[PDB]
XYZ file of C-alpha atoms in Angstrom:
695
model
C -8.851 4.970 -9.523
C -7.792 5.814 -6.006
C -4.238 5.066 -4.939
C -3.795 2.840 -1.917
C -3.248 -0.563 -0.329
C -6.830 -1.774 -0.354
C -8.220 -4.620 1.717
C -9.553 -7.507 -0.339
C -12.980 -6.652 1.152
C -12.737 -3.328 -0.699
C -12.442 -4.895 -4.166
C -16.218 -4.554 -4.512
C -16.178 -0.819 -3.785
C -13.285 -0.262 -6.217
C -14.143 -2.674 -9.039
C -16.038 -0.132 -11.146
C -13.233 2.420 -10.813
C -10.656 -0.202 -11.787
C -12.679 -0.912 -14.938
C -12.601 2.794 -15.795
C -8.813 2.642 -15.381
C -8.668 -0.254 -17.851
C -9.348 -3.462 -15.913
C -10.886 -6.229 -18.023
C -10.999 -9.149 -15.558
C -14.316 -10.106 -14.049
C -14.209 -9.291 -10.340
C -14.525 -12.765 -8.836
C -11.758 -14.132 -11.052
C -9.396 -11.654 -9.374
C -10.592 -12.152 -5.790
C -13.505 -14.424 -4.856
C -14.367 -14.583 -1.127
C -16.143 -17.971 -1.401
C -14.222 -19.726 -4.164
C -11.111 -20.045 -6.282
C -9.564 -16.930 -7.814
C -6.249 -15.419 -8.894
C -5.734 -14.536 -5.223
C -5.080 -18.245 -4.647
C -1.926 -18.053 -6.786
C -0.420 -15.411 -4.455
C 1.736 -16.459 -1.501
C 3.487 -14.754 1.385
C 7.104 -15.773 0.791
C 9.287 -16.667 3.800
C 7.403 -14.351 6.145
C 8.590 -11.104 4.553
C 8.127 -11.172 0.765
C 5.421 -11.949 -1.778
C 5.517 -14.602 -4.499
C 3.221 -16.159 -7.079
C 2.570 -19.627 -8.476
C 3.237 -19.855 -12.217
C 2.896 -23.550 -12.988
C 0.627 -26.536 -12.515
C 3.646 -28.086 -10.736
C 3.982 -25.450 -8.028
C 6.616 -23.156 -9.545
C 7.000 -19.903 -7.594
C 8.588 -16.645 -8.738
C 9.821 -14.020 -6.276
C 12.656 -11.510 -6.189
C 16.368 -12.290 -6.180
C 16.691 -10.324 -2.954
C 13.782 -12.308 -1.530
C 15.648 -15.530 -2.230
C 18.973 -13.992 -1.185
C 19.198 -15.771 2.183
C 18.763 -19.204 0.587
C 21.072 -18.426 -2.342
C 23.752 -17.433 0.171
C 23.007 -20.388 2.447
C 23.657 -22.796 -0.444
C 26.784 -20.989 -1.668
C 30.388 -22.083 -1.219
C 33.559 -21.062 -3.021
C 33.267 -24.289 -5.029
C 29.678 -23.518 -6.110
C 29.157 -19.763 -5.664
C 25.475 -19.377 -6.508
C 25.551 -15.805 -5.208
C 28.129 -15.030 -7.897
C 27.172 -17.280 -10.811
C 23.544 -18.145 -10.132
C 21.966 -21.567 -9.863
C 19.919 -23.600 -12.340
C 18.541 -27.015 -11.405
C 18.332 -28.916 -14.693
C 15.821 -31.387 -13.227
C 13.404 -31.313 -10.309
C 15.562 -33.746 -8.321
C 18.362 -31.144 -8.290
C 16.215 -28.407 -6.739
C 17.643 -27.546 -3.349
C 15.677 -27.879 -0.094
C 15.781 -25.053 2.425
C 15.710 -25.122 6.215
C 13.132 -23.033 8.084
C 11.402 -21.611 5.003
C 7.700 -21.208 4.353
C 5.079 -20.244 1.787
C 1.623 -19.156 2.992
C -1.589 -19.093 0.971
C -4.513 -16.970 2.154
C -7.354 -19.460 1.790
C -10.136 -17.291 3.258
C -10.585 -13.819 4.760
C -13.471 -12.876 7.054
C -14.458 -9.639 8.772
C -14.850 -10.518 12.462
C -15.004 -6.994 13.895
C -18.421 -7.474 15.508
C -17.335 -10.806 17.001
C -14.058 -9.379 18.331
C -15.785 -6.312 19.790
C -18.446 -8.574 21.330
C -15.755 -10.659 23.021
C -13.763 -7.620 24.173
C -16.695 -5.827 25.808
C -17.548 -9.063 27.632
C -14.165 -8.938 29.385
C -15.230 -5.573 30.874
C -11.709 -4.116 30.988
C -11.576 -1.018 28.753
C -7.960 -0.145 29.630
C -6.589 -3.592 28.744
C -4.390 -3.800 25.659
C -5.790 -7.224 24.703
C -7.520 -5.670 21.681
C -4.038 -5.561 20.086
C -2.432 -8.581 21.786
C -1.555 -11.353 19.289
C -1.862 -13.915 22.083
C -5.389 -12.794 22.977
C -6.502 -12.490 19.349
C -5.164 -16.008 18.764
C -7.356 -17.199 21.638
C -10.293 -15.503 19.917
C -9.227 -17.011 16.588
C -9.051 -20.526 18.041
C -12.474 -19.977 19.620
C -14.000 -19.191 16.217
C -12.172 -21.892 14.254
C -12.751 -24.238 17.177
C -11.861 -27.655 18.550
C -8.222 -28.308 17.591
C -8.471 -26.538 14.244
C -4.967 -27.290 12.956
C -5.015 -30.915 14.146
C -8.197 -31.622 12.167
C -7.098 -29.607 9.104
C -3.332 -30.212 8.815
C -1.140 -27.417 7.518
C -4.070 -25.014 8.001
C -4.123 -22.340 10.691
C -6.231 -19.350 11.711
C -5.106 -15.824 12.606
C -6.929 -12.648 13.674
C -5.293 -9.251 13.135
C -6.253 -5.716 14.160
C -6.631 -2.968 11.550
C -7.074 0.808 11.733
C -5.481 0.937 15.180
C -8.032 -1.531 16.530
C -11.228 -0.467 14.756
C -11.487 -3.405 12.321
C -10.625 -7.091 12.704
C -10.146 -9.702 9.971
C -9.704 -13.454 10.410
C -7.333 -15.228 8.011
C -7.357 -18.938 7.171
C -3.784 -19.689 6.131
C -2.275 -22.746 4.427
C 1.464 -23.001 5.124
C 3.965 -25.098 3.145
C 7.469 -25.573 4.562
C 8.973 -27.636 1.712
C 9.983 -24.833 -0.666
C 13.025 -25.621 -2.804
C 15.362 -23.348 -4.757
C 15.010 -23.971 -8.499
C 16.860 -21.162 -10.253
C 18.504 -17.813 -9.679
C 20.447 -15.501 -11.983
C 23.927 -14.295 -11.059
C 23.888 -11.360 -8.662
C 25.257 -9.172 -11.476
C 21.731 -9.548 -12.905
C 19.559 -10.068 -9.820
C 21.361 -7.299 -7.912
C 22.764 -5.137 -10.723
C 23.814 -1.764 -9.347
C 23.684 -3.114 -5.758
C 23.462 -0.326 -3.188
C 24.046 2.551 -5.623
C 20.899 1.754 -7.620
C 18.929 0.610 -4.555
C 15.744 2.696 -4.248
C 16.594 4.335 -7.598
C 14.666 4.680 -10.877
C 15.755 4.245 -13.721
C 16.553 0.697 -12.605
C 18.288 -2.045 -14.593
C 18.097 -4.946 -12.122
C 16.690 -8.349 -13.048
C 15.457 -8.961 -9.516
C 13.979 -12.462 -9.615
C 14.517 -15.978 -8.296
C 12.575 -19.235 -8.692
C 11.307 -21.790 -6.163
C 8.951 -24.772 -6.143
C 6.422 -25.817 -3.496
C 6.558 -29.512 -2.596
C 3.603 -31.210 -0.910
C 2.371 -34.672 -0.036
C 0.771 -36.705 -2.788
C -2.623 -35.078 -2.057
C -1.294 -31.507 -2.258
C -1.331 -30.948 1.466
C 1.412 -29.289 3.533
C 4.211 -31.649 4.556
C 7.675 -31.214 6.082
C 10.700 -31.635 3.861
C 10.799 -35.164 2.500
C 12.335 -36.639 -0.639
C 8.943 -38.364 -1.038
C 7.074 -35.063 -1.465
C 5.931 -34.131 -4.969
C 5.464 -30.696 -6.577
C 2.235 -29.014 -5.536
C -0.540 -28.933 -8.119
C -2.130 -25.611 -7.121
C -5.723 -24.410 -7.308
C -4.626 -21.655 -9.677
C -1.522 -20.089 -11.209
C -0.567 -17.040 -13.244
C -0.468 -17.079 -17.016
C 2.625 -15.234 -18.231
C 2.045 -12.585 -20.895
C 4.511 -11.715 -23.652
C 2.261 -8.821 -24.706
C 4.489 -6.288 -22.984
C 3.545 -2.914 -21.541
C 2.772 0.442 -23.139
C 2.820 3.783 -21.385
C -0.469 4.403 -19.499
C -1.372 0.674 -19.504
C -3.460 -0.498 -16.578
C -1.449 -2.418 -13.983
C -2.340 -3.983 -10.646
C -0.629 -5.863 -7.840
C -1.512 -8.241 -5.015
C 0.880 -8.751 -2.132
C 1.681 -8.396 1.558
C 2.750 -4.819 2.379
C 4.335 -4.836 5.812
C 4.158 -1.411 7.439
C 2.925 2.093 6.677
C 2.544 5.135 8.933
C -0.090 7.152 7.101
C -1.970 8.044 10.310
C 1.104 9.524 12.002
C 0.600 12.664 13.995
C 3.002 15.490 13.209
C 5.013 14.820 16.374
C 5.322 11.122 15.507
C 6.838 12.041 12.130
C 9.401 14.114 14.056
C 10.262 11.234 16.392
C 10.552 8.793 13.486
C 12.984 11.093 11.660
C 15.081 12.391 14.565
C 15.330 9.209 16.672
C 14.507 6.056 14.706
C 15.809 7.018 11.266
C 18.789 9.190 12.224
C 20.208 6.657 14.705
C 19.760 3.884 12.130
C 21.496 5.993 9.465
C 24.578 6.820 11.541
C 25.047 3.424 13.209
C 24.587 1.341 10.058
C 26.841 3.465 7.834
C 29.577 2.719 10.376
C 28.885 -1.025 10.516
C 28.564 -1.195 6.734
C 31.766 0.675 5.892
C 33.829 -1.737 7.991
C 31.939 -4.794 6.738
C 32.225 -3.911 3.046
C 35.992 -3.354 3.196
C 36.341 -6.807 4.757
C 33.988 -8.284 2.149
C 35.841 -6.940 -0.898
C 39.222 -8.193 0.372
C 38.266 -11.843 0.991
C 35.935 -13.946 -1.197
C 34.879 -16.157 1.710
C 34.098 -13.171 3.945
C 32.000 -11.946 1.011
C 29.955 -15.164 0.983
C 29.638 -15.263 4.769
C 28.393 -11.674 5.140
C 26.566 -11.013 1.856
C 23.101 -11.546 3.347
C 23.950 -9.831 6.646
C 25.245 -6.847 4.672
C 22.179 -6.619 2.414
C 19.726 -6.722 5.329
C 21.638 -3.895 7.015
C 22.140 -1.879 3.827
C 18.534 -1.875 2.591
C 16.854 -0.278 5.614
C 19.797 2.110 6.041
C 19.289 3.619 2.593
C 15.502 3.522 3.028
C 15.878 5.642 6.167
C 17.875 8.214 4.194
C 15.148 8.324 1.555
C 12.402 8.593 4.175
C 14.028 11.551 5.927
C 14.590 13.152 2.518
C 10.877 12.926 1.709
C 9.949 14.290 5.153
C 12.272 17.240 4.526
C 11.592 18.169 0.903
C 7.897 17.230 0.601
C 6.709 18.855 3.838
C 5.244 15.654 5.244
C 5.341 16.877 8.853
C 3.225 19.920 7.974
C 0.830 17.733 5.977
C 0.100 15.621 9.064
C -0.173 18.802 11.144
C -2.911 19.987 8.787
C -4.748 16.653 8.914
C -4.835 16.459 12.711
C -5.885 20.114 12.881
C -8.719 19.360 10.448
C -9.953 16.601 12.760
C -9.570 18.747 15.886
C -11.643 21.495 14.249
C -14.320 19.038 13.096
C -14.577 17.428 16.533
C -14.937 20.844 18.162
C -17.953 21.402 15.912
C -19.432 17.997 16.798
C -18.938 19.017 20.434
C -16.485 16.302 21.462
C -12.852 16.922 22.509
C -11.871 13.230 22.300
C -9.887 13.817 19.102
C -8.010 16.888 20.311
C -7.219 15.012 23.522
C -5.898 12.007 21.589
C -3.500 14.099 19.487
C -2.225 15.888 22.595
C -1.914 12.542 24.383
C 0.336 11.223 21.604
C 2.398 14.422 21.609
C 2.964 14.317 25.371
C 3.942 10.637 25.434
C 6.255 11.072 22.438
C 7.925 14.011 24.182
C 8.358 12.066 27.422
C 9.904 8.883 25.985
C 12.500 10.749 23.896
C 15.419 10.240 26.299
C 14.847 6.505 26.716
C 13.797 5.857 23.109
C 17.007 7.515 21.937
C 18.950 5.264 24.315
C 16.912 2.261 23.146
C 17.731 2.855 19.479
C 21.405 3.629 20.132
C 21.882 0.252 21.795
C 19.587 -1.630 19.397
C 21.293 -0.352 16.234
C 24.758 0.039 17.734
C 25.149 -3.228 19.632
C 22.235 -5.681 19.420
C 22.212 -5.323 15.635
C 25.723 -4.023 15.121
C 27.946 -6.329 17.187
C 27.539 -10.053 16.596
C 29.298 -11.227 19.755
C 26.645 -9.417 21.780
C 24.721 -12.624 21.006
C 27.507 -14.924 22.193
C 26.321 -17.581 24.675
C 25.355 -16.607 28.211
C 25.426 -19.520 30.711
C 22.004 -19.987 32.257
C 21.608 -19.999 36.020
C 20.593 -23.665 35.755
C 23.835 -24.497 33.905
C 26.375 -22.735 36.140
C 24.864 -24.490 39.169
C 26.185 -27.790 37.760
C 28.946 -32.649 31.117
C 25.313 -32.413 30.038
C 25.367 -28.637 30.537
C 28.667 -28.249 28.664
C 26.839 -29.681 25.640
C 24.050 -27.085 25.696
C 26.708 -24.357 25.921
C 28.650 -25.937 23.053
C 25.356 -25.812 21.147
C 25.000 -22.070 21.668
C 28.666 -21.482 20.876
C 27.992 -23.399 17.655
C 25.158 -21.154 16.476
C 27.091 -18.026 17.468
C 30.384 -18.974 15.778
C 28.695 -20.589 12.785
C 29.876 -20.791 9.159
C 28.962 -17.117 8.641
C 30.877 -15.747 11.650
C 34.315 -14.153 11.332
C 35.665 -13.129 14.733
C 38.192 -10.912 12.950
C 35.453 -9.095 11.029
C 33.346 -8.712 14.182
C 36.205 -7.140 16.152
C 36.803 -4.558 13.426
C 33.064 -3.833 13.446
C 32.776 -3.744 17.244
C 35.601 -1.231 17.711
C 34.072 1.129 15.138
C 30.580 0.736 16.622
C 31.472 1.004 20.327
C 33.517 4.133 19.550
C 30.443 5.916 18.184
C 28.343 4.355 20.946
C 30.717 5.480 23.708
C 30.817 9.003 22.260
C 27.010 9.355 22.158
C 25.935 7.589 25.388
C 27.258 9.090 28.658
C 29.172 6.947 31.139
C 26.423 6.799 33.777
C 24.114 5.444 31.034
C 26.359 2.766 29.516
C 25.741 -0.940 30.044
C 27.850 -1.839 33.042
C 30.606 -3.787 31.282
C 31.263 -0.876 28.906
C 32.565 1.301 31.757
C 35.854 -0.623 31.545
C 36.861 1.360 28.442
C 37.139 4.484 30.590
C 37.828 2.698 33.886
C 40.369 0.014 33.003
C 41.546 0.725 29.437
C 42.108 4.523 29.461
C 39.888 5.127 26.433
C 41.552 2.430 24.301
C 38.570 0.857 22.522
C 40.682 -1.559 20.458
C 42.419 -2.946 23.551
C 39.045 -3.411 25.267
C 37.609 -5.516 22.438
C 40.980 -7.241 21.953
C 40.933 -8.279 25.618
C 37.383 -9.647 25.366
C 38.399 -12.104 22.645
C 41.851 -12.787 24.116
C 40.675 -13.994 27.528
C 37.189 -15.351 26.772
C 35.995 -18.944 26.586
C 34.210 -17.961 23.355
C 37.001 -15.827 21.845
C 38.109 -18.684 19.570
C 37.398 -22.328 18.820
C 40.693 -23.342 20.443
C 39.888 -21.352 23.585
C 36.443 -22.957 23.847
C 37.827 -26.489 23.501
C 40.256 -25.716 26.327
C 37.213 -24.748 28.406
C 34.980 -27.651 27.364
C 37.805 -29.959 28.524
C 38.090 -28.801 32.145
C 35.089 -26.473 32.579
C 35.290 -24.118 35.519
C 32.462 -21.985 36.825
C 34.733 -19.371 38.425
C 36.223 -19.052 34.926
C 32.962 -18.422 33.048
C 31.351 -16.266 35.750
C 34.071 -13.659 35.085
C 34.350 -14.236 31.323
C 34.754 -10.863 29.549
C 32.595 -11.697 26.522
C 29.891 -13.282 28.688
C 30.010 -10.191 30.918
C 29.687 -8.027 27.792
C 26.753 -9.914 26.258
C 24.843 -10.047 29.549
C 25.442 -6.370 30.348
C 24.338 -4.966 26.974
C 21.302 -7.256 26.942
C 20.536 -6.231 30.524
C 20.418 -2.601 29.380
C 18.457 -3.487 26.225
C 15.697 -5.035 28.341
C 15.780 -2.340 31.036
C 15.155 0.262 28.336
C 12.414 -1.907 26.818
C 10.613 -2.525 30.123
C 10.839 1.195 30.835
C 9.671 2.220 27.349
C 6.944 -0.382 26.794
C 4.500 1.339 29.228
C 4.642 4.510 27.101
C 3.446 2.452 24.116
C -0.028 1.939 25.558
C -1.335 5.551 25.778
C -0.164 6.192 22.204
C -1.832 2.994 20.991
C -5.138 3.863 22.680
C -4.988 7.423 21.346
C -4.233 6.021 17.889
C -7.474 4.019 18.012
C -9.405 7.212 18.786
C -7.519 9.369 16.264
C -8.073 6.864 13.455
C -11.751 6.428 14.370
C -12.276 10.181 14.138
C -10.683 10.341 10.697
C -12.838 7.411 9.553
C -15.986 9.123 10.830
C -15.091 12.611 9.588
C -14.160 11.595 6.029
C -15.826 8.204 5.516
C -14.042 4.918 4.778
C -14.740 4.661 1.037
C -11.422 6.376 0.224
C -9.393 5.333 3.285
C -7.399 2.144 3.788
C -5.771 0.762 6.937
C -2.035 0.960 7.472
C -0.218 -2.075 6.102
C 0.153 -4.930 8.584
C 1.602 -7.850 6.584
C -1.799 -8.884 5.217
C -3.008 -9.336 1.667
C -3.825 -6.118 -0.209
C -4.315 -4.996 -3.794
C -3.277 -1.781 -5.524
C -3.786 -0.511 -9.067
C -2.592 2.290 -11.333
C -0.929 2.924 -14.706
C 2.458 2.119 -16.215
C 3.995 5.587 -16.154
C 7.282 7.383 -15.592
C 7.822 10.485 -13.500
C 9.811 13.718 -13.377
C 12.106 14.072 -10.332
C 12.925 17.738 -10.951
C 12.662 20.568 -13.460
C 13.321 19.612 -17.105
C 14.196 16.007 -16.135
C 11.817 13.188 -17.074
C 12.278 9.467 -16.426
C 10.284 7.257 -18.776
C 8.229 4.199 -17.921
C 10.614 1.512 -19.210
C 14.313 0.641 -19.118
C 16.136 -1.620 -21.573
C 19.099 -3.983 -21.692
C 20.953 -1.108 -23.363
C 20.888 0.638 -19.989
C 22.631 -2.303 -18.332
C 25.458 -2.092 -20.883
C 25.686 1.700 -20.566
C 26.277 1.214 -16.830
C 28.863 -1.597 -17.067
C 32.084 -0.895 -15.164
C 34.406 -3.887 -14.666
C 36.290 -2.008 -11.920
C 33.110 -1.402 -9.872
C 31.827 -4.513 -8.098
C 28.324 -3.028 -8.245
C 28.222 -2.687 -12.046
C 29.994 -5.736 -13.482
C 28.023 -7.499 -16.225
C 27.879 -11.239 -16.888
C 29.503 -12.085 -20.259
C 26.589 -14.407 -21.024
C 24.238 -11.417 -20.784
C 26.529 -9.254 -22.939
C 26.786 -11.906 -25.653
C 22.985 -12.114 -25.740
C 22.805 -8.324 -26.002
C 25.508 -8.043 -28.674
C 23.986 -10.785 -30.840
C 20.401 -9.561 -30.229
C 19.532 -13.146 -29.247
C 16.212 -12.086 -27.759
C 13.773 -14.666 -29.127
C 10.121 -13.837 -28.519
C 11.071 -11.917 -25.346
C 12.022 -8.701 -27.140
C 9.522 -5.921 -27.484
C 7.878 -5.821 -30.897
C 10.234 -2.894 -31.586
C 13.191 -5.288 -31.337
C 14.525 -3.734 -28.127
C 14.869 -5.841 -24.994
C 12.967 -4.590 -21.917
C 14.375 -4.874 -18.402
C 12.038 -3.061 -16.008
C 9.085 -0.704 -15.843
C 7.405 1.435 -13.196
C 3.806 2.163 -12.251
C 1.686 4.405 -10.036
C 0.719 1.497 -7.751
C 1.155 2.013 -4.005
C 3.548 -0.556 -2.533
C 5.955 -0.819 0.391
C 8.284 -3.282 2.100
C 6.672 -6.715 1.913
C 5.441 -6.225 -1.662
C 8.695 -7.648 -3.030
C 8.028 -10.388 -5.541
C 4.388 -9.333 -5.834
C 2.741 -10.373 -9.116
C 2.131 -7.428 -11.425
C -0.890 -8.076 -13.641
C -2.106 -6.455 -16.844
C -5.795 -5.766 -17.514
C -6.428 -9.473 -18.204
C -4.816 -10.601 -14.942
C -1.876 -12.089 -16.823
C 1.589 -11.697 -15.331
C 3.692 -8.882 -16.798
C 6.318 -8.419 -14.090
C 7.394 -8.767 -10.486
C 7.348 -5.777 -8.171
C 10.696 -5.330 -6.474
C 11.319 -1.729 -5.318
C 10.244 1.910 -5.155
C 11.857 4.995 -6.644
C 13.722 7.375 -4.325
C 10.764 9.733 -3.896
C 8.486 6.708 -3.445
C 10.121 5.938 -0.090
C 7.948 8.724 1.302
C 4.837 6.742 0.349
C 4.809 5.138 3.798
C 3.852 8.586 5.128
C 2.007 10.087 2.143
C 1.377 9.065 -1.459
C 2.017 11.823 -4.022
C 0.901 10.972 -7.555
C 3.716 12.899 -9.251
C 6.357 10.844 -7.403
C 5.213 7.400 -6.160
C 6.298 4.554 -8.438
C 6.709 0.838 -7.897
C 9.780 -0.526 -9.694
C 8.948 -3.740 -11.532
C 11.114 -6.259 -13.393
C 9.625 -6.988 -16.819
C 8.466 -10.608 -17.096
C 9.938 -10.812 -20.611
C 13.364 -10.093 -19.095
C 12.835 -12.823 -16.486
C 12.153 -15.279 -19.297
C 15.122 -14.089 -21.374
C 17.427 -14.707 -18.417
C 15.913 -18.126 -17.657
C 16.177 -19.089 -21.336
C 19.349 -17.500 -22.688
C 21.443 -17.103 -19.512
C 20.291 -19.986 -17.317
C 19.548 -22.384 -20.159
C 16.721 -23.955 -18.136
C 14.195 -24.724 -20.865
C 12.126 -27.020 -18.633
C 10.868 -24.117 -16.511
C 9.322 -22.325 -19.505
C 7.812 -25.566 -20.812
C 5.845 -25.905 -17.555
C 4.727 -22.272 -17.562
C 1.656 -21.253 -19.555
C 3.060 -18.488 -21.758
C 0.599 -16.309 -23.693
C 2.039 -15.066 -27.018
C 1.570 -11.567 -28.320
C -0.984 -11.000 -31.071
C 1.905 -10.365 -33.486
C 3.668 -13.672 -32.805
């Protein structure tokens, strides 16, 4: 019954409990380590989301916000798929995507003994190779052996460390890079309530999009080619129209990215006071400027919609995280846990665990000045100011027609279709003003002294001068440079001198801070080993690390405070209750309203006649679980995970059963939107849809 993000290896230890919670699948149909199972219909989507195959022709469902980058990339003012959605009426109209991927997890093996055998043979206990991806890849290649990817094309092998270095798993991955956009609702559906409803339950967002994996004519990975055909997969999800009742069993497979459940108390403090607080203040500044520019110009809106969402999501998550830390006493919970271990170890007669907790505390305390400076510049400038990534002429290039083409190339990517120099200047002035007020002069990147030195505090004039006099300040000014390129012109260029100075400081802080990482990491291995020994590993699971996990629970609402209860299911009536045509966040598509007003629900309505939108469950998910398949007790698809409730944000530090809920779009609502809003009948014909007993 236990909550958590369980390794696939732990399905055996949990299977009986899952049956007592309501599971009806046979175990090896869910996950089979030596054969085909439902696991083979799950994919890691574009390196940061989850998705699932739902057709014998390779159809993939994920979230709308998982497909957001590709929806935006294909959008223009002529065809604004962000605004009005997209629906390919035949496979030939499905849109290819550059630099996209879908990864299947073909096999998973425990290689802890092998990895520990290889490590001890190096005879270097202080080396950090036990965490190094480059070293673990060397160990992975050694096991897989003899040009593994060349022999098996599109297949690769990866080893990853778990439990701070106490467990190692090898993953055999099959990667497809021809993944085409098939359908997406308008953002008024897929992102209903936008930032206001982000991380909020009740939720009324139809957060889905639709892709299709293309392969060679044998089903093997192949680069984008109009000759590729839809993948016929080993396995795909049946879609259930049986709905969900309160207390129903529900389970999820997906790729949770990061948790911090083995944080010491002092690490929780650092995370809140440095990482989260700096992110909160810097990004609210960047976002306020950006949004005002976005709402005033429809093309600025297209160009920055994805940039704004990526900034906005982790900003609000940081607010929720610090709120959980404050109001749920998460710092004191970790204090108790590390004190429990310290007391146990004292009994056993070893101080290794008390030393490890003190070692973390001392390192955390020592790196606080630099880490604060690292996060101020990372959130304020590297993330916040786009022309910090303007081209810097390499040493090779300045000591030289052929080079002016490589610099044109980097000016191209910098000032691409998404880049507004006017928006960036408004952002930069607001960001540097907060930056200059929080970082003292003697600690600024060198070029930033000129605000005090040369510009008498005028931040606007400083940024204005960078664009005015720079080779990269405008397309016209770059052409004038590409015509008669100087080197005494570029070597004093204000934007180049800005980008190089802030990146100089960024790396100086990193190189200074990176040594402090190692004592914490080694102490973490000891701290986690002591907790595994003290309490056993039957009810513990390793922190998420972007690998496949499963979690189960019940469909159930929660109560956020006294006399207030939120139920387990929202309806299309809640969308209409929230409609506000004067609020960009809460506009409703007239096609959706007409369907609601006419009750044109088809077989997608609940048996009651009401139209579901979303439900929530006691599963334990985090960032990376977006688009994860949500299965009923028969393994049939009933929804797509897409968020957590506000209190659930604290689940990355501690799960609390009264408050942790995954927010899940009801699969019947996905189908209603495909059918009645998108009008794309062909996608439901290729799905295998299981009727309800009462149909």
